Design a protein around this ligand. Structure first.
Ligand SMILES: [Mn+2]
Ligand code: NA
Lengths: 106, 106, 106
């Protein structure tokens, strides 16, 4: 898939967490988010489509997705312990990175 | 360095997990698999030994290994919590991913 | 931060864990270490100043940092369970990896 489909998947699952009721929906949505971030790691953002795949910008893109993946791991650890409200609070932080990375690499 | 030795290690530790009696053997084999996958991250498969290290193929290679690493993390989290049967079942999700990465990139 | 600042962060937090008393300091220092390693993944060590970011040396550099990250996660899990002594023992292995990385890439 392209980078934009993965962006849309992240946003949709973030809203799903925003509306979630129990811990299972949070776990499933954050797992889908992890998968979408791993997939987006293989994509080229539009702003970097004219750049070397070996450029430092591509490296920084991928390592930023690594940082996001580790924050997602933290949120998933919170959700696996049944912490619904804290998983949602942590996901509210994920949003400020997902939308930001969206606004820059657009 | 060598893709084949690490793929071996993966298969052998999968067998060890399947034939394991307690959670400790599962944990140890999963740690060995994690080490082998991290090592294979640096390798170049023969199907791509004629491609550039920044090519999309190499990127997909390394990111598929990251995906395998997160699957191994899930299995290890299961094993640490004492759910041996669910950990083995999750390791049965690892055999298919390992085999696909094998056939496609070997 | 640069490469040197991140390595100094890693060292400082290593000692903090080493002389900590409760689990909270251990988890705080290990979280600092995780952030520092993720940031250093985007760095260019002095011995690789002019090599391409997609060079095999740089790929091995980033994968060594991935190994460090997974060890950091293991220590963080041991500390979150309350096993402070096991966490510090695991962080002793963290010191080995950090110092080897500094001795090879300085
Ligand atoms: Mn974990
Ligand atoms: Na890379």
């Amino acid at each position: 898939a392209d980078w934009e489909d993965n962006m849309e998947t992240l946003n949709d699952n973030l809203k799903v967490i925003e509306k979630a009721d129990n811990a299972a929906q949070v776990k499933d949505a954050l797992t889908k988010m992890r998968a979408a971030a791993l997939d987006a790691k293989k994509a080229t953002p539009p702003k970097l489509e004219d750049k070397s795949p070996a450029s430092p910008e591509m490296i920084d893109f991928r390592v930023g997705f690594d940082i996001l993946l580790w924050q997602i791991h933290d949120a998933l650890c919170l959700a696996n312990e049944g912490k619904v409200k804290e998983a949602q609070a942590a996901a509210e932080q994920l949003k400020t990175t997902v939308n930001a990375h969206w606004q820059k690499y657009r």
